[PDB]
Scaffold this active site. Structure first.
Site, PDB file in Angstrom:
ATOM      1  CD  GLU C  22      -3.168  12.095 -39.759  1.00  0.00           C
ATOM      2  OE1 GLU C  22      -4.361  12.024 -40.133  1.00  0.00           O
ATOM      3  OE2 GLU C  22      -2.255  12.412 -40.541  1.00  0.00           O
ATOM      4  CE  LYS C 100      -1.594  15.461 -42.742  1.00  0.00           C
ATOM      5  NZ  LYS C 100      -2.795  14.598 -42.560  1.00  0.00           N
TER       6      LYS C 100
END
Ligand SMILES: Nc1nc(O)c2nn(-c3cccc(C(=O)O)c3)nc2n1
Ligand SMILES: Nc1nc(O)c2nn(-c3cccc(C(=O)O)c3)nc2n1
Ligand SMILES: Nc1nc(O)c2nn(-c3cccc(C(=O)O)c3)nc2n1
Ligand SMILES: Nc1nc(O)c2nn(-c3cccc(C(=O)O)c3)nc2n1
Ligand SMILES: Nc1nc(O)c2nn(-c3cccc(C(=O)O)c3)nc2n1
Ligand SMILES: Nc1nc(O)c2nn(-c3cccc(C(=O)O)c3)nc2n1
Ligand SMILES: Nc1nc(O)c2nn(-c3cccc(C(=O)O)c3)nc2n1
Ligand SMILES: Nc1nc(O)c2nn(-c3cccc(C(=O)O)c3)nc2n1
Lengths: 121, 121, 121, 121, 121, 121, 121, 121
Positions: C22, C100
């Site tokens: 990520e 997110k």
């Protein structure tokens, strides 16, 4: 040959516009780029080197859209199409659509703009 | 002949991508499949055996999209088009569009991808 | 007192996330900031100095969202709320929501995240 | 304490429903899970171990939504809330909303369902 | 001649489908009808009698979509196109698209269906 | 007790409105119905008889919305809330929201309407 | 008393803004007005004179939004709330939300603005 | 030559319609105008005088859409196309799409209308 590579709804905050006020405040510009490219080889190989990397195209668009402020969208699409056709021989033709979703036009509408299609020579 | 059978916005969580990180984390892939098929006979008969069952096509797409991770979308669309043209003689041509709505590209956009059209031989 | 100042759907491309991958690839983070502020004086005066400039708040959020990559959204919302409460005495309380929309979670969903409300001391 | 952790628009294809036909064909179920959790510590630390991992919650929901078919959404939300409150002491209360966007109801509507809020004892 | 008359996103709750369960429960069917009609005369006259009344077309579609349950969408689009071409000589060709947004297919997608184009003889 | 049963975006074509013209032409009415009902028992039992069947509620709404034309939305929501509270003892309170998305008001807006909350006595 | 009358997403093209350039070019302003009004009497009577006509409220909003250009949204919401509370005794309290969906702020967001709630004295 | 200039989703509140009631109450009309214009010169020059100003086109559309009420959309699109082709020699052809999103048609649909394409002579 109907194969294409595409980048949709790319948005950049810029200062292009024929009006002084527009160059001062700026606005969001929406861009759609469609590339005519024969994708069979990459389809067979699965090798990234047999196609056009979308990440690199977005960078070219970005540099033009977030760069020096010009007056027309026509000029902006013309420099983008020219820049993509120039660096990629695999692109047989480039289509660039630019939308001003919030122009200095007193009214109710979804957006205004232009679209150009440029063959790679 | 402008008749078609279509499956829109099919979404699968997969691990395809040229980047290691992408293969590790995975992402959602959007797929649109349009099939050129003469639908008059089925239109006359109302017999499911005179057309192409959308449920079976979705399964073929799924198996390819949720299967082994490859590098390109070109490779993914190429295996899908090939798999549909192969099993159905009624499909005169197959169009596959694949969209990466959230690729490892630092920017603001709606999506990136490719589209291929493959005639059934 | 139910008056508020708000900034909705602010999007930034960042590299926060507890996963290595990520931090490497990055993703879009959606932020919503709601400020409890008594707006009557500005409502009476029409003087920009009697309220909190939304443009300055967006800059504070941006600097935090497009800055060094942290592990949690909790840490990101905590630094934002703290930064806004600190610079503006007029803000009685700050609410920060972070989403997110495309996390490394194998599934179909609209988004994941957190929301914090912090009173200004 | 108004802090929350949330998972929105989670969609699962299932076979729950009081009608035989529904259990046979199945349908998409939309789920929204909101957890009341004090997020300050994680906000301070930036340590994933000071909060509730959204990825693990989605898995719990999934196992229940894509598992054995029951008759009611009430039963489905009750097992989810119970499963989350049980495994996480940090969750002070769990809210579960389940939507049947396409139920066997002859009409035009966006969706039907239920919402429950369960405090963790 | 590129003139058209169109009816978009028409929705009807019906019981068509090759599966017993589908005929029992029913589902929403989305229909898009585009008619090729020379609109210049009506454009000149402003006389409703020089064109095709959209209200009457919707009624024809409705009667077919909310009527007896058949197995295929192909059969449903074929009866609609046939019914419109038959009653209106001004319609040079009829295009009918039918979408099953919620079919008994275990997956995540926006919709499935067919599209036919029928010239009026 | 924060448990609820809900029916969202229910749409009906009707002829209510204080204006003659409105009663003549008709328009689409959007309705949202939220019922406060303790859902734990049904959550435990999974027995449909321990809750309120959404299908039956939609029918009550429908009969009122597609029935005789009245002047106000207030009157329409009042008859719906009254009809639901009356037939279901399990409903502790009923909330009805009605929206006129296309009223005879010369302007640009998303919708206009009312919302009432009625406790069941 | 939770009854309300509401006008959502009202859009007007105006020239308010603290920046010269903004006053020059103008932009779209989104307005949401929610009125706390006891609707039972009108619910019983079905008499338009027992409630607040949404059409008249929109006109008041419009006159303020499409009128002289001011600097703040706070000033604009304050004059609207004041104008509605003043002319209608039935309005116990007025909530006005104003959104600048396209402000001179270099970034990506859905909108910025304020919301005020004013009780009618 | 595939270059175009476009104005999308332009909305006007008008009183056109073959029905008396429609002329009385009015409704929102959605208009999409696409102009075929060679944009290379403007693309090269960046001079506004080498293209067609979208702001001026919107004004022409507006004057026709918010002007005297006619019966057909065909008549409305015909006067718009004629007005644009007439004042701009650079426009090689004009396409006008008009949508009645809320017509006096008892049913559930997204919209109804027409689309005309007129070459500039
Ligand atoms: N939020 C944001 N991000 C960027 O990368 C930007 N670049 N520019 C920018 C700067 C200078 C000129 C232009 C232009 O479009 O001419 C754009 N504004 C931005 N906002
Ligand atoms: N939620 C969900 N459902 C499935 O059926 C999935 N299949 N895969 C999956 C597994 C292995 C490889 C791939 C791939 O795309 O290469 C996808 N992820 C899923 N998530
Ligand atoms: N398109 C775009 N624009 C910016 O202003 C960005 N800033 N970052 C960025 C750079 C370094 C760290 C982070 C972070 O979020 O940690 C973000 N990515 C961007 N993309
Ligand atoms: N596409 C898809 N993916 C999954 O992971 C699924 N799981 N189920 C499933 C299987 C058995 C029972 C149920 C249920 O909901 O009761 C759901 N259908 C799926 N479709
Ligand atoms: N809400 C609603 N409205 C109508 O007009 C309907 N007509 N049918 C209906 C009845 C019988 C058969 C079919 C069919 O599609 O075969 C549809 N269901 C409806 N629901
Ligand atoms: N498409 C459609 N379907 C229905 O079931 C309808 N019922 N009404 C209707 C008939 C008579 C009065 C009213 C009313 O709302 O007062 C509504 N219009 C419909 N359109
Ligand atoms: N399209 C459109 N329609 C109207 O009714 C408008 N009124 N104003 C307008 C005129 C003068 C001042 C303002 C203002 O907001 O201060 C707005 N712009 C419009 N555009
Ligand atoms: N809100 C608003 N703004 C305008 O500029 C309008 N013009 N008309 C209008 C007036 C007279 C006739 C027509 C028509 O369409 O025939 C439209 N209604 C409006 N509403």
């Amino acid at each position: 040959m109907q194969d294409t590579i595409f980048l949709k709804g790319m948005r950049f905050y810029g200062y292009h516009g024929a009006l002084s006020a527009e160059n001062e405040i700026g606005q969001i510009f929406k861009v759609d780029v469609t590339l005519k490219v024969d994708l069979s080889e990459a389809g067979r190989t699965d090798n990234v080197i047999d196609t056009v990397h979308y990440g690199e195209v977005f960078e070219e668009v970005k540099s033009i859209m977030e760069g020096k402020a010009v007056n027309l969208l026509e000029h902006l699409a013309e420099r983008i199409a020219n820049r993509i056709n120039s660096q990629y021989n695999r692109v047989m033709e480039t289509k660039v659509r630019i939308t001003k979703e919030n122009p200095p036009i007193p009214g109710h509408y979804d957006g205004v703009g232009i679209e150009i299609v440029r063959e790679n020579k």
